[PDB]
Design a protein around this ligand. Structure first.
Ligand SMILES: O=C(N[C@H](C(=O)Nc1ncc(CN2C[C@@H](C(F)(F)F)NC2=O)s1)C1CCC(F)(F)CC1)/C(F)=C\C1CC1
Lengths: 108, 107
């Protein structure tokens, strides 16, 4: 069906870290708020460095910290400001960072 | 205004070799549930316990750890219902990162 009903009283399902800090590609969380969306608040990861932290605790510029982006669904109020009717909308969220070897190629 | 039941139009409006190039690489595993929307969820599983160093070897002094995110899914309620759901909060692995291990002698 096009329209379905959804009970917003969330049940947790098997939901029972300092990774953001201990990582060689550490990140911080930034609050993204949208009153026309459910969830209204989304926390996005922003990599602290361009390079990665090495064994000596220094930034290695030969490696890159890259955000891992995921495609997430959100509920957008439709019509706008509606408390009880929504449309699914696909957005991209940064969920953390990883350390990668850079893509290399000569200028054409 | 916070109603218990709301209406949702499922016609979505839209608004990557990391898994291999990473020092904490991972593979994707397909999790399928016909009682859930989205029915298919791809989860990351770290390939190694350690991390890949400059020389392409596994460094056992570092750990590959999965990054777990809390996500919401729709579970059919009552079961098998094509048009009614309850929001459910689950934990998914979305990739891996390389961390310096947490060390401690225990009592
Ligand atoms: O949960 C949030 N949104 C939910 C959502 O997107 N669920 C998803 N499930 C699997 C997905 C695809 N993916 C992502 C990646 C990994 F699962 F690993 F993430 N692998 C995958 O296969 S997307 C919506 C909430 C509204 C709804 F109507 F209930 C439908 C689902 C949301 F908006 C925000 C959460 C970040 C705080």
């Amino acid at each position: 069906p096009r329209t379905v009903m959804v009970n917003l009283n969330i049940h947790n399902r098997n939901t029972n870290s300092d990774y953001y800090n201990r990582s060689t590609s550490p990140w911080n969380l930034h609050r993204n708020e949208d009153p026309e969306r459910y969830p209204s608040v989304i926390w996005e990861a922003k990599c602290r460095h361009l390079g990665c932290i090495n064994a000596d605790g220094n930034v290695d510029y030969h490696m890159n910290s890259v955000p891992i982006q995921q495609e997430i669904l959100v509920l957008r109020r439709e019509p706008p400001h509606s408390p009880n009717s929504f449309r699914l909308e696909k957005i991209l969220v940064s969920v953390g960072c990883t350390c990668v070897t850079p893509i290399v190629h000569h200028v054409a």
